[model samples]
Target chain A: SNVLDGLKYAPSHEWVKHEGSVATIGITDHAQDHLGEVVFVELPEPGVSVTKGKGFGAVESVKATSDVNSPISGEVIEVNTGLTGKPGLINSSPYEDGWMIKIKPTSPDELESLLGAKEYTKFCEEEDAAH
Target chain B: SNVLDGLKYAPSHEWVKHEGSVATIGITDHAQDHLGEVVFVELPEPGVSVTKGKGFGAVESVKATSDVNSPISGEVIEVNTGLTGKPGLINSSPYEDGWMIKIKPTSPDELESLLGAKEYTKFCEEEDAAH
Candidate 1:
């Protein structure tokens, strides 16, 4: 499982990188590898509101499609249209060009509820072991 | 503006066709016409929850990307995977093959808040005149 520092993660496998009130989200590298080649990414439009812990969109791989949850509540600011043409970007760059949505968080305090990289790496190990 | 009878219409331009607890959602023909040449569609994964009046996903066109709103609240049961390959299905068949998601609605009463075909056509006429 690859976990990067300076990011927060959800139990469901989404990661958040926030600067002030704006946050960018994407699935963890572990999540992409687990799902296998991502074929399509379903993203919300800018201006849509997303709730913390709620399903805002989905990521479809050859194996299966999984819901992508928001790590914090906010209005969607932008989505990576690049994924529409090259869904494989998620496999090649889960943290960079493969990023999903950018949002203006309503409750920045919710960031505290997410896991640190070290904790998330441990969480992924435990989850993989169980499954 | 092709508004089909027997379907409920949301103000934002989504349509719903319900049978008991399961409801199928799609964008209206007027919406498709308003958004020329859909190149990509963003659909939620099965088992995700969608709320009425909130964006469940998005539809991207050669022109611009627009949010696809849910007409009723519930758990999403399935999505039209066909659109991943041929998003223009939304333009050629907005009501049939272009259907977006199926959900088990939480409150069927929400349907009453939507417009009938005749009412929606009239609404579209008024909206078109304004813009």
Candidate 2:
């Protein structure tokens, strides 16, 4: 599990980077590994609101369709438009190009709920152990 | 599209319930119904960090595997331990019994980015119109 530094985590496996009141969000390597090959990604519309704990869009892999939850409540500032036509970006580069949405947070204080790099990795380790 | 009051939304279809620094997160009923027959759920561990907009976990439906993004960046405080074995709960009661994880947020200010119930329903209706 590659838990990159300088980012916060959610137990659900989403990672976030803060830029003032706006944040960039994406899935972890551990996550892409679990999903296998990616096929499609459904993202939120620009300027629409996304709640802190809600699903903003969805992703489809060879075997499943999963909801992409919003790590923080906010408006959809931008989305990875290119990814829709090239969903494999998630498998080839889960962290960089595979990045999902960019949101203008509703409550900047809510970021405090995330986990750190070290914490997220350890958490993955435990999960691997369990399965 | 049934937009319940007092619930915040993400354009992707995840919802949030902010309680202090902690928030509860899950996919919308629309999300679950779309996936159809969930077979498995993968969640982050307690004490792990979940980044906003990044995938904190995954859910497997008969048709595909999808990422469950975290709506807010934070530490995963708790998980719905029973979900892995009883994945149907998501399709049956997405907002209540199907609740996924509880998180302690890193930035409480991030909640402002999400949509209100009315806005979310409109978001969904637009989506249905598109599809």
Candidate 3:
């Protein structure tokens, strides 16, 4: 599970790469590994208001459908519509090509509370042990 | 995609084994593998009404929360409460101890539409190829 050094992670497993008020969002490598092969993605429409920790979208694997929760309250600016036809991008390139949505955060301060790569890696390890 | 010879699968990857009206349900092996290491399970309440293809419960892996769809619409008679403390049972034995919910089917006729073992196997292969 690769965690980008500069990105911050939510407990829900979403990662954010913030640049000013706009942020790029995607599931972590750990997420793609756990989800196996993604088959479909249900992305929120642009301009939709999203709250932290609440589902903003979903992804379906052959085995199950999982919610994609937002890490920060924001308005969606764009979504990777390419996923509707090629959800495997998540498995192939979770950080870049697999990015799910971009948002303009309502509260930039919330970004400070997210886990850094080292911490998130430890959290994932602990979660693996717990399972 | 190996649907057991006598088992009936739900759209959500749960499979049911009906003995009279009591139906046993669990995620297919395809589900466990796709979910990776399952960390938690939310089983339906006993006596709760579950509709076909509707969410009756959920499973949480390190990545996300996925709903478990009920196959045969009915009232839940029992749940594999063991999963509460040992969710990995799904990864270890989905068709046995990993069973999620047991329902008294409202209509056994619904079972007729489910994929059989052979069809399920082919479906899994196709799903794999698609990814």
Candidate 4:
């Protein structure tokens, strides 16, 4: 449940890092933690157009499959195919080596729409309280 | 998993049944099937305002916890508390007894943003292909 600084989040738990017009995206630590023992990862190819807030990839664990949504509308400029062969990286290094896709966003303003780290942490808290 | 007509769906897998301004919400059959023997149900109280696309409640199974997002922003007017004692209804009757919440929708336009049943099934196929 670590929320790294300088990253934005979709309420669905995907994280975004803005690098000018580019965004580095991945599922958040909380996501993988809940997922448990990821056995598969599916990702989009470079050059694919992904609508912001829509499904771009998926992760499957022992019990469930979850979507990895894009935080900004963009063209997928890069994807780490490495996860296909070794999906556990997501559970071990969500913020660093396990990063999933990179995109050249259609608009920088979309970044403003995502939750900041603090906001995301609070969102998680509220979400967890449902029981 | 069964997809029913006359329902709108959030990509995250919540289903909405619009009855005038009030919308009945539930997780898809696909959701409960993936979850398996749900052990706990978490829901909000009546009169709470839920923003569309944000976390409103959660479900806990034997292995994972999943957030239930509100497909249409609204004031929650009812919740299915019966599931707290007999959560198996989610797997046995996802569209009926398992229904999660009813909201007095803030706008009909919010209903337009969700996928129709056919579109949601297609979305499910695309989502399951990421490996």
**Model 4 interface CAPRI class:** incorrect
Per-residue lDDT tens digits of candidate 4, residues A12-81?
Answer: 8989888777889998899888888776676777898889877677776755656667788989989988
Ranking according to DockQ, highest score first:
3, 2, 4, 1
Report residue B126 deviation for candidate 4 (angstroms): 2.4
Q: List clashing residue pairs in candidate 4.
A: A42-B130, A130-B42
Q: Write the per-residue lDDT of candidate 4 for residues B1-113, one digit (tens) a residue.
A: 79999999876688998887789999898888777789998899998998776667778888677667677788999999898889888889899999989989888897777
Local accuracy by lDDT, each model? 0.85, 0.81, 0.83, 0.83
True contacts kept of each: 0.00, 0.29, 0.54, 0.21
Q: For model 3, how does the per-residue alpha-carbon lDDT over B1-131 read when each residue is reduced to its tens digit?
A: 33567887754577889987698988988878876899988886787898765566798887666777676799888888788998999988888888888888898899997877777787567666743
Flag regions of model 4 displaced more than 4 Å: A1-93, A96-131
Q: Residue by residue across A52-117, what tens digits does model 1's lDDT show?
A: 988788775543346677999999989999987787899899999899999999999999989999
**Every model's TM-score:** 0.56, 0.54, 0.60, 0.60
Candidates 1 and 4 compared by TM-score, better number: 4
Q: Model 2 over residues B4-119: C-alpha lDDT tens digits?
A: 68778888788888876779998888888887777668787799898878877777665455677788788888999989878789888898888899988898777899899888
Per-residue lDDT of B83 in model 2: 94
Q: Give the DockQ-based CAPRI class for model 1.
A: incorrect
- Of the candidates shown, which would achieve the greatest DockQ relative to the real structure? 3
